[PDB]
């Protein structure tokens, strides 16, 4: 006799169970929020804890071939965005001296494209960090009511949605 589910109880044949394909434990459908009628519609089942781990590890796993191609498509979508104009290329040292006096880790979409090309990134978190740097640098350097700051707000919102469901 083994103990199963998050509730740690022995098997009761009068209750509905669903098996997790990742950890191989069994769960009462009632304890994990899934009814028999709903279970019929899914091929594999991943329990809540295993799913939380899978969701969290998406940004830490190795970037695959397909991931890299996907990153290129994500960059292309941002590059075509109306609010991406301040972030397409590095700030021109000649248009703006003190920009580089205070930003030592600048970032832009063209530089990110180069980094994706040469596979500088090896985990999604690294790509997301560079993207976030583009927006954080902008918000650090410009007033919140300024067009530059707000473009970062808009594009970051667009970015977050674009990245939904990115990893296989």
């Amino acid at each position: 006799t083994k103990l199963y589910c998050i509730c740690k109880t022995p098997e009761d044949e009068s209750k509905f169970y669903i098996g997790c394909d990742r950890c191989q434990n069994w769960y009462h459908g009632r304890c994990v929020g899934i009814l028999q009628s709903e279970a019929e519609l899914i091929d594999e089942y991943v329990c809540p804890q295993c799913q939380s781990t899978e969701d969290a590890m998406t940004v830490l796993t190795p970037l695959t071939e397909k991931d890299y191609e996907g990153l290129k498509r994500v960059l292309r979508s941002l590059q075509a965005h109306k609010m991406a104009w301040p972030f397409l290329e590095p700030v021109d040292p000649n248009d703006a001296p003190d920009y580089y006096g205070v930003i030592k880790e600048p970032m832009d979409l063209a530089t990110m494209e180069e980094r994706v090309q040469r596979r500088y990134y090896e985990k999604l978190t690294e790509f997301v960090a560079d993207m976030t740097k583009i927006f954080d640098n902008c918000r650090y350097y410009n007033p919140s009511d300024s067009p530059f700051y707000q473009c970062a707000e808009v594009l970051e919102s667009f970015f977050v949605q674009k990245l939904k469901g990115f990893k296989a």
């Binding site: 098997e11 044949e13 009068s14 209750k15 509905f16 169970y17 669903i18 098996g19 394909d21 069994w26 459908g29 028999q36 279970a39 019929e40 899914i42 091929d43 594999e44 089942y45």
Partner: peptide, 6 residues
């Protein structure tokens, strides 16, 4: 999915 029902 793998299940156990009555």
């Amino acid at each position: 999915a793998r299940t156990k029902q009555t």
